[PDB]
Amino acid sequence: LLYMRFTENFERAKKEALMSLEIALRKGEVDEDIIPLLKKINSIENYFTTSSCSGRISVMEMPHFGDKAKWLGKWHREVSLYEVLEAIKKHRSGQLWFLVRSPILHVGAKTLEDAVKLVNLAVSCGFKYSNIKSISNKKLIVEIRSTERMDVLLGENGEIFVGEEYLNKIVEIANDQMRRFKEKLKRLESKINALN
Amino acid sequence: MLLYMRFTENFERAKKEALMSLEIALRKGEVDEDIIPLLKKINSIENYFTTSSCSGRISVMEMPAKWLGKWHREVSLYEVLEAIKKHRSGQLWFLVRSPILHVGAKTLEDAVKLVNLAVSCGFKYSNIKSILIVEIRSTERMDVLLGENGEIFVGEEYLNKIVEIANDQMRRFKEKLKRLESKINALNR
């Protein structure tokens, strides 16, 4: 590690990140929910954004938990029991899981001080799992993430273990968590202005 | 002020206090035996010291939290079932948590070298935390909804499967801890 090299390389790193975002947007590959937030972060002089996401609910099958797998259903919105049931109907092999995951934002910072300021702001907005993920000679990345999540086993190798009542309760909680993620992202967007 | 050569403020005093806290924890057996080797190795390195740390854990809890059961080892189905029977209100969850270590470091270079090594050993969520300190953490976390407001939604067969998967994670945790401990010597100069 070369001290202060990421600061020296910041202008370059930001320009490259902006080009990547510009194309991603025009290609319709960015979760629309957080497009406003990403544009806002990039409008602040000492930061830029890299690959990010706004939260997800998924019905997927994998050999063993943690070994991320095949997505039968993937949503970054709240879902209905119908949508989930349609995904479940496709289950054939491995462990079938219903997963809820927090949004994840990766942000480059010009200095260590800028990074710590952002981490502290993110935590204040409800993203307790925010921190400095990496420091290299090219850039310093801050990761913003929340603690909410769910991992429910739905079946294994074609067999389904749950019924409609339990599935209804799981979807209810899942949608509550998704609602919280969306609320926290909007809160962060409104407060990042303080970074100036 | 953030100083690269003074990453963890008052390192000397902090390490002296941390070593004192570890001595007490060891004597009362309040230290997860699974992480003892690693903790001792990290503190033997001049540029580091460990603080609030823990090994992987399985628990049953309810929140609107109240812990109904807590274990730092592979659990049995029956001890988990008994914990679940204590559920009365709120959301009932079965949780699996990765071991977590907090490490102080003399310089930023020391902190980054440790994060990079930990990540290479399987602790992908290792990072630099603002309180600055290094946090070492893995990814095999689990949060399973089991019931709500006194009503359990799952049966014993289902719980047995969850317990088996949880124990599989705990074994994976032990494996990663051994790999990290066997490589931590590289940080010495």
Side-chain angles (χ1 to χ4, degrees):
Chain A
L1 177 67
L2 295 185
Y3 284 172
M4 304 178 298
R5 256 301 167 73
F6 74 93
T7 300
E8 290 148 29
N9 291 319
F10 185 79
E11 182 183 310
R12 184 93 166 188
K14 179 156 185 170
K15 275 187 196 154
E16 303 184 330
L18 289 172
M19 305 192 297
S20 297
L21 179 56
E22 175 190 293
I23 189 58
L25 287 173
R26 93 172 190 179
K27 289 196 297 179
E29 301 167 343
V30 184
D31 299 312
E32 58 262 51
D33 191 302
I34 60 178
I35 290 179
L37 172 60
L38 298 178
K39 295 179 179 178
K40 203 65 178 60
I41 294 170
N42 285 294
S43 75
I44 307 301
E45 188 173 61
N46 304 326
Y47 305 102
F48 61 82
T49 64
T50 61
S51 55
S52 305
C53 55
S54 67
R56 72 168 189 295
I57 295 169
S58 315
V59 168
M60 55 83 96
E61 51 178 47
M62 58 187 145
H64 301 70
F65 183 73
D67 195 355
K68 304 182 187 305
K70 177 186 175 65
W71 278 263
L72 306 181
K74 185 167 60 183
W75 310 275
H76 67 73
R77 278 190 186 95
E78 302 177 71
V79 302
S80 56
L81 202 31
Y82 172 76
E83 287 180 297
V84 178
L85 296 167
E86 295 292 67
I88 287 172
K89 177 185 175 180
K90 303 175 181 178
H91 174 50
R92 293 287 185 296
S93 179
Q95 308 180 330
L96 181 64
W97 289 86
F98 179 98
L99 310 174
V100 176
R101 294 292 184 274
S102 159
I104 300 179
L105 313 174
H106 284 173
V107 185
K110 184 175 182 177
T111 70
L112 180 59
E113 186 179 305
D114 293 318
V116 176
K117 285 176 57 58
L118 172 59
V119 166
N120 291 163
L121 173 65
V123 171
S124 80
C125 291
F127 295 98
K128 284 294 182 179
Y129 289 148
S130 299
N131 47 55
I132 292 171
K133 178 191 180 60
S134 55
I135 305 182
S136 70
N137 294 327
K138 294 182 181 183
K139 54 193 174 188
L140 181 165
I141 298 299
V142 164
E143 181 171 70
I144 298 176
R145 189 169 67 79
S146 198
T147 67
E148 288 47 59
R149 66 180 291 168
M150 183 156 33
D151 308 285
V152 175
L153 181 66
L154 300 178
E156 303 189 317
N157 295 307
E159 184 186 314
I160 301 308
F161 305 143
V162 309
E164 189 168 59
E165 184 53 62
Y166 183 33
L167 188 61
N168 178 238
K169 298 297 181 183
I170 293 167
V171 165
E172 186 188 323
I173 297 293
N175 286 335
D176 290 335
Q177 294 177 316
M178 179 65 40
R179 189 193 294 198
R180 290 176 59 183
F181 295 148
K182 304 306 186 179
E183 293 158 41
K184 291 182 175 180
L185 289 164
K186 290 185 177 65
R187 281 169 54 190
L188 179 57
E189 186 180 314
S190 74
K191 299 304 181 185
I192 49 64
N193 301 245
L195 299 176
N196 290 340
Chain B
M1 62 175 93
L2 299 176
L3 294 162
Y4 279 37
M5 286 188 275
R6 294 272 253 234
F7 180 81
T8 295
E9 189 180 304
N10 291 267
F11 187 89
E12 176 178 50
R13 190 47 100 141
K15 180 153 189 183
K16 284 181 173 182
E17 304 186 317
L19 290 177
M20 289 175 53
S21 298
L22 182 56
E23 282 276 45
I24 298 169
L26 296 170
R27 149 181 125 224
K28 286 199 176 185
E30 296 179 64
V31 175
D32 320 63
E33 298 87 296
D34 202 301
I35 66 172
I36 292 180
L38 184 50
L39 295 185
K40 293 190 173 180
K41 184 57 187 302
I42 297 171
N43 284 295
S44 77
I45 317 304
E46 174 172 45
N47 293 341
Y48 305 102
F49 71 82
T50 58
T51 65
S52 304
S53 301
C54 59
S55 68
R57 181 177 68 184
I58 291 171
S59 85
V60 174
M61 62 84 103
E62 51 175 43
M63 72 165 265
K66 185 180 185 302
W67 274 265
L68 303 178
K70 315 177 69 291
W71 308 275
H72 54 47
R73 55 172 174 64
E74 295 181 63
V75 302
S76 65
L77 171 63
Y78 310 114
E79 63 196 322
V80 175
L81 277 176
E82 187 53 56
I84 292 173
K85 295 196 299 184
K86 274 158 206 112
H87 174 52
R88 291 299 183 184
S89 63
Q91 313 183 335
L92 177 67
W93 297 85
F94 171 90
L95 311 175
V96 174
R97 289 286 178 281
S98 157
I100 183 47
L101 306 165
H102 284 184
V103 188
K106 287 195 175 186
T107 73
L108 185 65
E109 171 175 52
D110 295 315
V112 176
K113 285 188 180 189
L114 178 59
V115 168
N116 291 343
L117 187 179
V119 169
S120 73
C121 287
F123 296 85
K124 306 307 180 179
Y125 270 124
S126 299
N127 59 92
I128 285 172
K129 202 173 174 171
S130 183
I131 52 179
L132 302 172
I133 62 156
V134 169
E135 184 176 72
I136 296 178
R137 179 188 55 176
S138 194
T139 64
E140 301 67 58
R141 174 187 169 187
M142 190 183 339
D143 294 58
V144 191
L145 178 74
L146 302 186
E148 172 180 14
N149 296 301
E151 181 57 55
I152 309 304
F153 307 143
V154 309
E156 191 175 310
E157 184 180 300
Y158 183 88
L159 212 78
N160 189 232
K161 302 165 185 170
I162 293 299
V163 166
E164 181 168 304
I165 292 170
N167 291 334
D168 288 319
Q169 303 316 301
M170 297 292 263
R171 292 204 295 286
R172 293 180 67 74
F173 292 145
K174 203 207 285 279
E175 183 179 2
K176 287 183 175 181
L177 288 168
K178 303 188 73 64
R179 180 161 63 274
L180 175 57
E181 185 259 63
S182 67
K183 315 245 167 230
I184 220 68
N185 183 23
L187 291 185
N188 272 318
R189 292 153 169 193

